[PDB]
Structure formats: structure tokens, C-alpha cells
Symmetry: C3
Subunit: 317 residues, 3 copies
Amino acid sequence: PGATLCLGHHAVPNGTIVKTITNDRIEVTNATELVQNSSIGEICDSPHQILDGENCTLIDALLGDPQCDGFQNKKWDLFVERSKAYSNCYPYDVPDYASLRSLVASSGTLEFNNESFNWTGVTQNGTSSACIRRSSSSFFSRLNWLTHLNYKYPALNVTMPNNEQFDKLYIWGVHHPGTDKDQIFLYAQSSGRITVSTKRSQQAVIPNIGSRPKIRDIPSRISIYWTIVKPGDILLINSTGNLIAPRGYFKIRSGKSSIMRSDAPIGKCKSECITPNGSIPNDKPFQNVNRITYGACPRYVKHSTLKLATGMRNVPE
Amino acid sequence: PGATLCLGHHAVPNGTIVKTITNDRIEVTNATELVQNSSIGEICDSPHQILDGENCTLIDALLGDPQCDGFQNKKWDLFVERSKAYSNCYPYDVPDYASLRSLVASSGTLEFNNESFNWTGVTQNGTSSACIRRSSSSFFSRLNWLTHLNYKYPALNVTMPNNEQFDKLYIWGVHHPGTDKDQIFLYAQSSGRITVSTKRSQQAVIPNIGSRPKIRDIPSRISIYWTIVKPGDILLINSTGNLIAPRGYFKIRSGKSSIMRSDAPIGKCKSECITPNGSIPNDKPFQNVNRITYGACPRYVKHSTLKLATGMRNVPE
Amino acid sequence: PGATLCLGHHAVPNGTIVKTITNDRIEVTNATELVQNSSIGEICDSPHQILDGENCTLIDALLGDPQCDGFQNKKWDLFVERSKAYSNCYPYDVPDYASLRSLVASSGTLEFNNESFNWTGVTQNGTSSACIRRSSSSFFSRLNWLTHLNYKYPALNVTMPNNEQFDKLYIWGVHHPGTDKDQIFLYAQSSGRITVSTKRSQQAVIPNIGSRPKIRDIPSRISIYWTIVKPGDILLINSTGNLIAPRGYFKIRSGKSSIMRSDAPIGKCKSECITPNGSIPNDKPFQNVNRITYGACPRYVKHSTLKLATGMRNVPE
Ligand SMILES: *[C@@H]1O[C@H](CO)[C@@H](O[C@@H]2O[C@H](CO)[C@@H](O[C@@H]3O[C@H](CO)[C@@H](O)[C@H](O)[C@@H]3O)[C@H](O)[C@H]2NC(C)=O)[C@H](O)[C@H]1NC(C)=O
Ligand SMILES: *[C@@H]1O[C@H](CO)[C@@H](O[C@@H]2O[C@H](CO)[C@@H](O[C@@H]3O[C@H](CO)[C@@H](O)[C@H](O)[C@@H]3O)[C@H](O)[C@H]2NC(C)=O)[C@H](O)[C@H]1NC(C)=O
Ligand SMILES: *[C@@H]1O[C@H](CO)[C@@H](O[C@@H]2O[C@H](CO)[C@@H](O[C@@H]3O[C@H](CO)[C@@H](O)[C@H](O)[C@@H]3O)[C@H](O)[C@H]2NC(C)=O)[C@H](O)[C@H]1NC(C)=O
Ligand SMILES: *[C@@H]1O[C@H](CO)[C@@H](O[C@@H]2O[C@H](CO)[C@@H](O)[C@H](O)[C@H]2NC(C)=O)[C@H](O)[C@H]1NC(C)=O
Ligand SMILES: *[C@@H]1O[C@H](CO)[C@@H](O[C@@H]2O[C@H](CO)[C@@H](O)[C@H](O)[C@H]2NC(C)=O)[C@H](O)[C@H]1NC(C)=O
Ligand SMILES: *[C@@H]1O[C@H](CO)[C@@H](O[C@@H]2O[C@H](CO)[C@@H](O)[C@H](O)[C@H]2NC(C)=O)[C@H](O)[C@H]1NC(C)=O
Ligand SMILES: *[C@@H]1O[C@H](CO)[C@@H](O[C@@H]2O[C@H](CO)[C@@H](O)[C@H](O)[C@H]2NC(C)=O)[C@H](O)[C@H]1NC(C)=O
Ligand SMILES: *[C@@H]1O[C@H](CO)[C@@H](O[C@@H]2O[C@H](CO)[C@@H](O)[C@H](O)[C@H]2NC(C)=O)[C@H](O)[C@H]1NC(C)=O
Ligand SMILES: *[C@@H]1O[C@H](CO)[C@@H](O[C@@H]2O[C@H](CO)[C@@H](O)[C@H](O)[C@H]2NC(C)=O)[C@H](O)[C@H]1NC(C)=O
Ligand SMILES: *[C@@H]1O[C@H](CO)[C@@H](O)[C@H](O)[C@H]1NC(C)=O
Ligand SMILES: *[C@@H]1O[C@H](CO)[C@@H](O)[C@H](O)[C@H]1NC(C)=O
Ligand SMILES: *[C@@H]1O[C@H](CO)[C@@H](O)[C@H](O)[C@H]1NC(C)=O
Ligand SMILES: *[C@@H]1O[C@H](CO)[C@@H](O)[C@H](O)[C@H]1NC(C)=O
Ligand SMILES: *[C@@H]1O[C@H](CO)[C@@H](O)[C@H](O)[C@H]1NC(C)=O
Ligand SMILES: *[C@@H]1O[C@H](CO)[C@@H](O)[C@H](O)[C@H]1NC(C)=O
Ligand SMILES: *[C@@H]1O[C@H](CO)[C@@H](O)[C@H](O)[C@H]1NC(C)=O
Ligand SMILES: *[C@@H]1O[C@H](CO)[C@@H](O)[C@H](O)[C@H]1NC(C)=O
Ligand SMILES: *[C@@H]1O[C@H](CO)[C@@H](O)[C@H](O)[C@H]1NC(C)=O
């Protein structure tokens, strides 16, 4: 009579197709997806400190456009710039805009310390109807539009030492008036010149008078520049007109801070990984949601799906 | 008596040596090469639309050097620049030449639309004996050399709105005459100034008078600049002399177009992959022909040969 | 009675833990480390030709700061810049400093050939008390500070052809004096202008008069520029004041030369691979000593240890 003893393995009714080195379609008992392909559609506000820029670019929060006053001295891990953002102050450009945005985003703070420059022989606090703060002609909060006093603009030659233990970031500008009349009306002479220097750097700018296409009726422009002053170094601002002066300095830190362009809403939840589409889970090693990421994120790949086998070959019958 | 039954495998007289993880030389029955190591020596004219630059660089076809007139309004997938190319018009330089070449190559068209600027109070259509078109002093086809009329050069302040649905690329320049005599002879005053602006950009250039080493007897130079004008934006050209003006705009597209330096002839054949050496087959995943490629190409590697085993270990006797 | 024959394998009392695809800790009989994690703490002077910069940056050895006179005409495979380096000549900056440093480091030579420019109508060999050579006011060895002769500075317009078979690298500058008095005291007129050109390039610089913060009592600055002249091309130096002129050219080679910042001492020993920490052995394929390397080096990785099994699984008892 005897007996029979059969050795065997399980199978399932609902197997999953995976790829191998030798077969592009083979059925296994179970698999798990390694490419995260979805976001929750919102940026979770923990654990990273998120600053929603709302109507303001980071640079407009830096300069101090009036709609951005609530951003003064704020800090962030990630600044979120919205596509609806708009400027509503004096028209300006920034040569190497991208670099200024980057270095400020990376620093993660708009901490600003006022300094007294002793501007002697000029009118301070120039305003404009293109920059309205509380129904009143105004200007960039962190900039000081210096004009003539008594049809005189004497040569400024001003020193600000850095006696602190941290670096200072000075933001300043140069006014390019629309016509020759304006050049005289504000600075009482035809040729501006600005030199901003330290021991190790010098930035000399000549204004360029003329019409640019009008933005809120203004054919003139301000061009923005920046200067970092190390401890033991000295800012030296030598100018004879057309200086849009600093009111102080920004702290410049190094850390983990950045900036991202997104229109996703901010939600009350926890997620380590942020993309412009929203936060994504980070269990999986890869993702195809967005090449732009911040935090502990799966690596971006161009595959919609990669299934890792977690069981044997499925052999029904 | 009984029988014998032997199990076995084939072998071949002409095996091939491959590399493995454990052995750098092992013989298998057959292998296939994964590194493409040869080109046909010519650039196949299908499936990619090839434009042979012949004696012309892309920038000379853009500006409109007289030998390049046949390139007006042409389109390409790949522009091929030959090493025999030479310029034969007024000497010029392009600050950030590489970027202009790149953006035009990438756009893939020299489609040009003429516009009427209404230059009032200046002579248009200045010519030079260094730029000969049909045995006649001439100039860049797409540029307009403006000089004085009646020893007067009044301040130009000219607007061209972009009311189209596509971007416009303006190419223009600044004449740097050789001596002070020339500055007066052409512009009837000593100091040129050019400002070209949009709502968002401004490019201000001062000419610089003096001798550069002569090229076809010319110690003067033109410097070339470009300006992109978006829909709803406005070009504004404010100048008091030394303007080499645009006659219109180039369409600027985005697509799959590029440029390549090669001396390989163009042939009538089909090949997806182009290198400077010529077209290469793209069956193999890798190639060692050239790091420069266009199209569906094997990836460049620093290996002359990589043989993939396609059979068992070859064990003769 | 019969016999027993047992098949088996060795084991050791002192096994080593390795990682596999399926197990992060498994014991094998032996392993070898693939990440080099230590340096000898000194830069071996063979087989690479090492030039210890000591108190001198490469740029100070180029210009010819007096403490760097021993570097004249030296060659290197690797120039080593020390953190104690300091400048002790006239204060200067170099726009795109990084690029000048790179191209000279890569060239691997300070071979300098004097040329006669025939400076006619100017005083040559201007000196300064900020640049002391042998207890005597002096200047950069490779630069020629041209000032007025008899309160006249006539317009220089000087040509130097390259009739050699190699490229020439010209280094030159522009003096930015501290005040308007100085501008007259040295150049006997208010407006300098410098144009340096070749057939294919032009560099026009305007000086900018004013105070920068003093360095060894000097509020003025020299700005350094460079020009490469190919065979058959011509240097043309057109200037009306404020030219810090070249005394000749540097040979510019291409080869395997570079530069490294390190404070490690130089030792008498042989090692193919150099890092800022010192030379490292290059038997192993990887290293975690430094991302900065020169020579035949293991590849930098972010792992402290990677043990490759060199024996079977160790199964004691
Ligand atoms: C150089 O030319 C430009 C272009 O014409 C001049 O700027 C233009 O000035 C006019 C006159 O004020 C502006 O027109 C006005 O527009 C407003 C806005 O809707 C409207 O309310 C008025 O009825 C009038 O049409 C126009 O905006 C402006 N154009 C641009 C592109 O900025 C400029 O004045 C000239 N330069 C000098 C120094 O005059
Ligand atoms: C600044 O100096 C330069 C260099 O000497 C002057 O340019 C030179 O001008 C001469 C005189 O016309 C040119 O010489 C001629 O060359 C042709 C070409 O083969 C030949 O047919 C003539 O017999 C004569 O030798 C020379 O080409 C030219 N050199 C360079 C490098 O461009 C320049 O004129 C001076 N600046 C001013 C404003 O005068
Ligand atoms: C523009 O303003 C600056 C800043 O005040 C002026 O430069 C400064 O000039 C003074 C006077 O010589 C220097 O002070 C001296 O310092 C030395 C060094 O220890 C000391 O021995 C003297 O007793 C005296 O205190 C000062 O160094 C210098 N400051 C800087 C930052 O460079 C400059 O002179 C003004 N511009 C013009 C054209 O005058
Ligand atoms: C198929 O395999 C996956 C991965 O092994 C299983 O998913 C895990 O399930 C456990 C429950 O025991 C969870 O705690 C884990 O979070 C899951 N891991 C992952 C990576 O998702 C899944 O349960 C398996 N399915 C079956 C039917 O056994
Ligand atoms: C996440 O956002 C990206 C970027 O917006 C989305 O990818 C874009 O999708 C649009 C329209 O669907 C395409 O026209 C673009 O070409 C895509 N951009 C890129 C860079 O590929 C993406 O679909 C979003 N993903 C998820 C899961 O929401
Ligand atoms: C050695 O192996 C290669 C690859 O398997 C064979 O080359 C293929 O041959 C077929 C003919 O049946 C062609 O249609 C394919 O285009 C070839 N493939 C490649 C990648 O070249 C080759 O024939 C084999 N040699 C022998 C003797 O069997
Ligand atoms: C394809 O073209 C390249 C570039 O011309 C060739 O590689 C060069 O060959 C020359 C002389 O034979 C060498 O001096 C260069 O160093 C090579 N350049 C590079 C970048 O490596 C290459 O041999 C050609 N290949 C084929 C198959 O024709
Ligand atoms: C453990 O394995 C390593 C690598 O196989 C052995 O190290 C080698 O030892 C030989 C001596 O026969 C030396 O010549 C080599 O330079 C060593 N190679 C490396 C990469 O270090 C080691 O000896 C083995 N240990 C034992 C006990 O067998
Ligand atoms: C080799 O040198 C590097 C660079 O100096 C050392 O790494 C730095 O160590 C300091 C202090 O120990 C840290 O503050 C830095 O963050 C490190 N720099 C980087 C870029 O990581 C390194 O320890 C040295 N390695 C050895 C083996 O000596
Ligand atoms: C942003 O700007 C829009 C349009 O001007 C305005 O209606 C809205 O209230 C602003 N929102 C914030 C948060 O400032
Ligand atoms: C200018 O404005 C600043 C900042 O608000 C203020 O402290 C100061 O009173 C004003 N100064 C002058 C000179 O009007
Ligand atoms: C500041 O520079 C201007 C011109 O750049 C000059 O007139 C003035 O003397 C300088 N400052 C002083 C007070 O020296
Ligand atoms: C290109 O230039 C050469 C030399 O000037 C000339 O002989 C040739 O005909 C030109 N070829 C074309 C296609 O324009
Ligand atoms: C200048 O040349 C253009 C383009 O060929 C032509 O349309 C026009 O007739 C000329 N204009 C003047 C003012 O001579
Ligand atoms: C154009 O600019 C010049 C100087 O830049 C100026 O004289 C002129 O007024 C400007 N155009 C007009 C007509 O306003
Ligand atoms: C380098 O400079 C220091 C400090 O001035 C000096 O004491 C030392 O002798 C110098 N060393 C060399 C090698 O020039
Ligand atoms: C200037 O110095 C150079 C280099 O030391 C020397 O050859 C020459 O004699 C001097 N020239 C004049 C004009 O004083
Ligand atoms: C050199 O340039 C200056 C102004 O840039 C000019 O006055 C002079 O004529 C030029 N050289 C000569 C001798 O032509």
C-alpha cells in the first residue's frame, strides 16, 4: 500500500506581472511599487517651516514692496512663491536676479537691522505714487531714496564698519531717471556716479537716463545691487547722485533653507518631502511626480511604474 | 548488454572571448558587440532635416552676410557648420556669441518678418566696401546702418509693440568707429548712446572709439546684441548715434533643433543618429565614435569593445 | 564495519561581517576594505612635480609680488596654495579671478618672455611704498606702471604681433586712483581710457576714480585683465592714461597641470594620488578622504567602509 509525500509551493488567484533580466513579463505571487506616482495636492506645514509668499516674490519681500510688510524679519525652511505674485512699487530690475533670489532663499531669513548712515546735505525718504503704502505715496521699506537739499547734492563718502561676528548683506540701488529734467529735478546735476566698495570688492555704476516703457506711468527704473561685508571689513558708499541707499543690513545665514515655485495650498499635516505638486510620501525609493523636490525625497525617475517582486513565480492550476 | 544514454551540449570550432565578473577571458559559443565603433562617414539627410551651412556660420546666416543670402527664412532640425566657413562682411563681435548661436540653433528657424520703424531725420541703408553684395558696397541684409542726414542725427525714440501671439527676437548692433573723424563723418557728433528696452529688460551700450587691428582694411567694429520681446510687450529703441538698427524680427520657436560642427558630407540615406564623423547605426546601446550626437543615439562610452555573450561556455574536444 | 567519508569546508575563529543584497550583516571567513579612509598627512613630491606656493597665491606669483620672485619661470604639475598666503604689493582685484587662476594653473608654467613695447612720451617703471622690493619702493615685476613725462601723457597706440608658433598670454591692468588730484599727478589729465584688442577680441576699460577702504594706506586699486594672442594675431594697446602695462607675455600651454589648496607638508616619498589632506594610497577603488583629488585616485564616496567578501560564509562550531 505505502504512501505518497509531495513537496510543493503556494500560488495565488491574483498574481502580479513584473520585469526581470530575461523576461519583460513574468507573474509572481506579490510585488510592491517602487515609484511614488501621486501627491496629496497640498504642501504639509510640518516638519519644515513653510513661508507662503502669497502675492509676494522673495525679492519683493526683501526690498520691502508695501504689500509685503508682513514678511519683515520672517524666517523659513522653504519659501513658496506663487504664480499670482505681482510687484506694486517702483519698477526695478536686478542684474543677476537669479543669484540674489538664490542666496537669500538659501540664507532663510529676512532679519533686518537698521543702521544710521548720517546722510548729510541730502533729503532722505523720497516717495512715489507708483509705490502706495496706506493710501500715501511711499517707497521700498528697506531702501532710502536720497534727493537734493536746497538744489545741492554734495558728494557722499560714507563708511559703515562691520564690527559684528556675522556677515552683513547690503541691498541698494541706482535710479535711472526717464529724462534729463528729472535728473536735475531730483539730484540737481546731470551725471550721477555710485561706487560701493569693501576692502576686497568694488561695484561702480553709472546711471543711464532715458525712457523705458512705462509701468504704472513710470518710464524710469531702479537697478538693484548687493554687497556682502565680512567681519572686520568696511562698507564705503561714495556717490554724487542717483543712489537708492540702504537703511541697514540683512543677516545672511547658511543652512538648509530654499525656495520653490508652487500653487499648491498649504495644509496642516506632516510630510518630509515637498514637491511643487504637493507633499509626497517617501516610503518608496523613487518617484515620478516632479524633478523639483525639497526634503527627504524619493529620487526622480522617468518610469511610471517599477514593481519589485516580493514573492515567488505564481504558477496556477 | 544494456544501453548508454549521454546528456550533453553543443560546442563550436570558432568561439569568442568575453569578460565576466570572475574571469576577464572566457570562451563562449557566440557573442554580440554592444559598442558601435564606426560611422559611414556621411550625414544621412533623413529622417532629420539637415541644413548644410557651407561657407556660412549660423550667426552669419542670421545677420545676413552676402554669401549667406540663400539661407534667408530657412528651417532645420540640424544646422551643420563647416570648418571652412569664413565671414566676408563688416567685422563684428558678439558678446556671449555662444549663447546667441545656441538659442538660434535651438529655435531652428531664420524666419524673418520686416517691420517699418519710421526712421525720421537719418540716412538709412549705409554700406561698406568690406561687405560686397553683387560687386556693390553693401551691408548685413537684416541690419540697417543709420547715419546722419544734413549733418544732423536727432535723438531717435522709437516704439515697436508686439501685438502677435509669438515671441520676437530682435538682432541689432553698435558701431565702434576707428577714429574721432569717422564718429563725426557718420553721426555728426562725438558721443553715441544706445538704449534698447522692454517693460522687463534694458540694454544700454556706449560706443568705444579707436583702432582695432584691421580686417579687410577696417579698424572699426560692430558689436551685436539681441532682445526678445514677448506678446503684449514693447521694444523701445532710444539712441543718439552709432545704432546698427534691426529691419524686423526673427520668429523664435522651441523644438528639437540644434547645431553641429562637422566636415562630413551629406548623403542620401536614412539614419536616426548623427555624429560629427557621420551617421552611425543605433542598434547597439553604446558607441565610441563621438561624445557629440544628435537624434536616437547609442550612449558614448570609453570602451573600444564590449562583447555580450549570446551562448554557453564553449568547451571543445 | 565499513567507513564514513564526510565532505566539508573550513571556518575561522575570527570572521568578518559583510553586507549582501539579502542581509545587512553576514559573517564570512575574510574580507577586504574597498574605501581608503586615511592619508599619510603629507603630499609626496613624486611622481608629480609639486610647486609649494608658500606665502604666495598663484596670481601673486604671476603678477610678480616681491615675495614671489623665486617663482619666476617655474613649472608645475600641481601648484599648492597655502592658507597663510598673503599679498604685499599694490592692492588689486581681478574680475573673474577664478578663471585667471584656473587657466594659469591648467597651463602649468610661469615661463615669461620680455618684449620691448617702445613706450614713447611716458615715464616707465612707476613704484609705490606699498610694494617693497629690497627695502625700496617697487612694483609687480611683470607689470609696468606708465605715468606722464613733462606733464604730458600722449595717446599710446602700440602693436605687438605674435610671430611665434605658440599662444601668448598678456597680463595687464588699469589704475583706479583714489582722488582727482592723483589722476592729474600721475597721468596729467582727468579721463583715462584703455582699449586692448586683437583681430577677434576687444577689452575697453574706463577707470573709476574714488576712495576704496585703505590697504597699506592705499585707497586706490589696480584691476587686472588678460588677453590671449594667437599666432598670426596682433595685440593692439590703445590708451590715453591709467594703463598698467605688460612687460611681455606668458607662455600658455595645455597639459595635466592643476592647483590645489592644502596646508599639508611636502614629503620625500612616492604616491600617485594627492588630496588636500595629503597623499593617499590608490590600491582601493574608493575613498572617503576628500572629494578634491589630483592624479590616479580612488573615487570619492560617502561611505566610511565597504567590505568586499574574499571568502565563504563563516560557520563555526
Ligand atoms: C519715447 O517714446 C515713448 C513711446 O511713445 C514715450 O512713452 C509714451 O508716452 C505716452 C504719453 O504720455 C504714453 O501714452 C499714454 O498712455 C496712458 C496709459 O494708458 C494713457 O492714459 C494716455 O492717454 C496716453 O496714451 C505711453 O504710455 C508711453 N509709452 C510707453 C511704451 O511707455 C516716451 O514719452 C518717449 N520719451 C520721452 C522722453 O518723452
Ligand atoms: C594704431 O596703430 C595701428 C598699427 O600700426 C594702425 O593700423 C595700421 O595702419 C597701417 C597704415 O594703413 C596699415 O598698414 C597697411 O597694411 C596694408 C595691408 O597689407 C598694406 O597694403 C599697406 O601698404 C600698409 O602697410 C596696417 O594694416 C594697420 N595695422 C593694423 C594692425 O591694423 C592704426 O592706423 C593706428 N591708429 C590710428 C587711429 O591711426
Ligand atoms: C572717504 O572716507 C574714508 C573713510 O573715512 C576716508 O578714508 C580714511 O582716511 C583716514 C584719514 O587718513 C584714515 O585714517 C587713518 O588710519 C590710519 C591707519 O591706522 C591711522 O594711522 C591714522 O591715525 C588715521 O586714523 C582711514 O584709514 C581711512 N579709512 C578707510 C576705511 O579707508 C577717505 O579719505 C575719504 N575719501 C577721500 C577722497 O578723502
Ligand atoms: C505584498 O508585499 C508587500 C511588501 O512585502 C506587503 O506590504 C506590506 O504589508 C505589511 C503588513 O504586514 C505592512 O506593514 C507594510 O507597510 C507593507 N509594506 C510595503 C512596502 O508596502 C503586502 O502586504 C504583501 N501582500 C500580501 C498579500 O502578502
Ligand atoms: C506635477 O507637476 C508637474 C509640473 O506641473 C506635472 O507635469 C507637467 O504636466 C503638464 C500638463 O499635465 C505638461 O504639459 C508638462 O509637460 C509637465 N511638466 C513636466 C516638467 O514634465 C505633473 O503631471 C504633475 N504630477 C502629478 C502626479 O500631479
Ligand atoms: C550570434 O548571436 C547574435 C545575436 O543573437 C546573432 O545575430 C542575430 O542574427 C539574426 C539572424 O537570425 C539577425 O536577424 C539579428 O539581426 C542578429 N542580431 C544581432 C544583435 O546582431 C548571430 O546570428 C548569432 N550567430 C550564430 C552563429 O548563431
Ligand atoms: C570621430 O571623430 C573624432 C573627433 O575628430 C575622432 O577622435 C579624434 O581623433 C584625433 C586623431 O585621430 C585625435 O587627435 C583626437 O584626440 C580625437 N578626439 C577626441 C575628442 O577624442 C575619432 O577618431 C573619430 N572616430 C571615428 C570612428 O571615425
Ligand atoms: C584576506 O583577503 C585579502 C584579499 O584577498 C588578503 O590580502 C592580500 O594578501 C596577499 C598575501 O598573499 C597580499 O599580497 C595582497 O596585497 C593582499 N591583497 C589586498 C587586496 O589587500 C588577505 O591576506 C586575506 N587574509 C587571509 C588570512 O587569507
Ligand atoms: C580631510 O580633509 C577634510 C577637509 O578638511 C576633512 O573634512 C572636514 O572636517 C572638518 C572637521 O573635522 C569638518 O568640519 C568639515 O565638514 C569636513 N569637510 C567636508 C568637506 O566634509 C576630513 O576629515 C579629512 N579627512 C581625513 C581622513 O583626514
Ligand atoms: C492678492 O492680490 C489680489 C489681487 O490684487 C487681492 O484681491 C488679494 O486680496 C491679495 N491677497 C493677499 C493674501 O494679499
Ligand atoms: C526718514 O525715515 C526714517 C525711517 O522711517 C525715519 O527714521 C526718519 O525720521 C526719516 N528721516 C528724515 C531725515 O526725514
Ligand atoms: C566720492 O566720490 C566723488 C566722485 O566719485 C568725489 O567727488 C568725492 O570726493 C568722494 N568723496 C569724498 C568726500 O572724497
Ligand atoms: C566657398 O568659398 C570658397 C572659397 O572662397 C569658394 O571657392 C566656393 O565656391 C564657396 N562655396 C560655396 C558653396 O559657396
Ligand atoms: C532702404 O532699404 C530698404 C530695404 O531694402 C528699402 O525698402 C528702402 O527703400 C530703403 N530706404 C531708404 C530710406 O532709402
Ligand atoms: C532718447 O534718448 C536720448 C539720450 O539717451 C534723449 O536725448 C532723447 O530725448 C530720447 N528720446 C526722446 C525723443 O525723448
Ligand atoms: C612667510 O611669511 C611669514 C610671515 O610674514 C614669514 O615670517 C616667513 O618667513 C615667510 N616664509 C617664507 C617661506 O617666505
Ligand atoms: C624700466 O625697467 C626695465 C625693467 O627692469 C629696464 O629694462 C629699463 O631700464 C627701465 N626703463 C626706463 C625707461 O627707465
Ligand atoms: C588711441 O586711442 C585714443 C583714444 O582712445 C586716441 O586719441 C588715439 O588717436 C589712439 N591712437 C592713435 C595714435 O591713433
